[PDB]
Structure 1
Amino acid sequence: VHLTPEEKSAVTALWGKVNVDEVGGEALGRLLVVYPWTQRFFESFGDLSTPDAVMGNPKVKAHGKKVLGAFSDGLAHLDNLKGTFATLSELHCDKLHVDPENFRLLGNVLVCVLAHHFGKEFTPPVQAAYQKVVAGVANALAHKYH
């Protein structure tokens, strides 16, 4: 949960460029397509029956914005990720029963989405900084299981 100045610079330089209206929906949609058991938690979202159905689904886009907003909040509070995600940890663990491995999977799908959008700019060191972040978010979201 501690980033060096190099890792902080990598994360912050890229994050200001992220389209917060789209990237969350892209990551959530790809999670649902690539790891189809995750659809079990989103039956209320409607048609998830094909990749095009998932990626065009308005509830997927809308929820993805909220998910990314929580990632952004975590980026603003790297030194206190457990306290930033405590309420969401209660929700996902006590109420939704999401296995915490899926937190890791969504973090890695987000990393893939960043790579897809930013290309050469998403260098191996930039990726490594983002992997520290998404691991920290996953661990904070899983805290209520511990």
Structure 2
Amino acid sequence: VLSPADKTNVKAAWGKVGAHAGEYGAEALERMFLSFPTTKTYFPHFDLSHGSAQVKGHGKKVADALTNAVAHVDDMPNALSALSDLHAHKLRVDPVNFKLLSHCLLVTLAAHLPAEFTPAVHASLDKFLASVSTVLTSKYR
């Protein structure tokens, strides 16, 4: 579970990404596709070229959904309810891939927010991403 300290750290670190939502999401996705090529099997319908509008768009949708979750950190099952529906019944991305994206999001945040990325915040963000993944996969079966 996210502790209140966890919730404080996430809100602080993420409010900090702010307007770079789209930029950081796209970077995270690109880190993922490159480091973990198997993840591209979910995007054979994207131009996965560095800088592609498709990846930039998805990045923003991912960041915005994460912005939402932070904004409703106490009530994430409900706030992400339609998204978990989408992933459970249509996209059907194997659960293992969420840890890979979550990892690349951590790496992205570390590379952009050196001041904010303390060991304690690193830990809180890792738990947070994990909880989002859990919510997004809660309806799989």
- TM above 0.5, one fold? yes
Q: Please, what is the CA RMSD of the aligned residues? A: 1.5
Q: Is the 8 A contact 1:20 1:65 kept in 2?
A: yes
Listed as ranges, the matches of 1:24-39 within 5 Å are 24-39=25-40
Is the counterpart of residue 2 in structure 1 residue 20 in structure 2?
no
Corresponding residue to 1:94 among 70, 89, 99: 89
The TM-score normalised by the length of structure 1 is 0.87
Aligned to 1:137: 132
**Unaligned stretches of 5+ residues in structure 2:** none
Aligned partner letter, 1:2: L
Percent identity of equivalent pairs = 43
- The farther-off stretch of 96-105 and 68-77 is 96-105
Amino acid at match of 2:88: C
1-structure distance, mates of 2:96, 2:78: 20
How far 1:36 moved relative to its partner? 1.0
Q: How does 1:68-83 map to 2 (within 5 A)?
A: 68-83=63-78
Report the Cα offset of residue 145 of structure 1.
1.5
Q: Deviations 1:82-105 (Å, cap 9, x if unpaired)?
A: 122222122222212200111122
Contact map agreement 2:22 2:61 (CA 8 A) in 1: no
| Pair 1:21–1:145, CA change in 2 (3 A) | closer
Q: Which amino acid aligns with 2:96?
A: E
Going from structure 1 to structure 2, the CA distance change for 1:2 and 1:119 (only over 3 Å counts) comes to closer
1:115 aligns with 2:110: yes
Give every structure 1 segment of 4 or more consecutive aligned residues whose post-TM-superposition deviation is greater than 6 Å: none
Shift of residue 79, structure 1, vs aligned partner: 1.6
In structure 2, C-alpha distance between the alignment counterparts of 1:31 and 1:24, rounded to whole Å: 11
Letter in 2 for 1:87: A
TM-score (norm 2): 0.90
Q: Which moved more, 1:18-27 or 1:84-93?
A: 84-93
Structure 1 residue runs without a partner (length 5+) = none
**Number of residue equivalences:** 139
